[PDB]
Amino acid sequence: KVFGRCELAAAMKRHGLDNYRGYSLGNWVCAAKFESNFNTQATNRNTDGSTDYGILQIDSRWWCNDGRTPGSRNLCNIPCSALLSSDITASVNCAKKIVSDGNGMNAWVAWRNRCKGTDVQAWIRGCRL
Incomplete structure (x- = not known):
């Protein structure tokens, strides 16, 4: 399934990624876009x-x-x-274990190179959350 920006943001929030290990929703949405x-x-x-x-x-x-x-x-x-799957549960669950492994979101190369230090809040702008 190809997600919409605001729709994936909604699903990530529901699965408890917003602020997980200190990483705002904008970080996860940016990471998914470029990955x-x-x-x-x-x-x-x-x-x-x-x-x-x-x-x-x-x-x-x-x-x-x-x-x-x-x-x-x-x-x-x-x-x-x-x-x-189109259901993102297993992905989100596995991501949580990865981000808790000591290196945070650096484990994702595209986040390190294209999201880290940028205005990631832009990725949830206009969205109904």
Whole structure:
């Protein structure tokens, strides 16, 4: 599913991402825009052979099982295909564990490079929340 900006903001709020570990809603919406362009079905292959899955592009090396990443871990305890659903629950739940791992939102490269330090509140402007 391709989410609208304000609609994904609404769903993220409902799942308790607004201010999670100190990160405003605008940060999560910006991260999703540049990771996947709001597309839940977005996949991308990494040079190390792992794959990134879904709206927040969760990595199969550490976080999910896709059955083709030798030596990998599955810290979120779900199949990677679960992260591609139109229901964002499993993605949001896995994101929470990642953001609590010590490095905050830096774990997402597109957030570090394109959202961090910017006016992220622009991403929820005009939205009914």
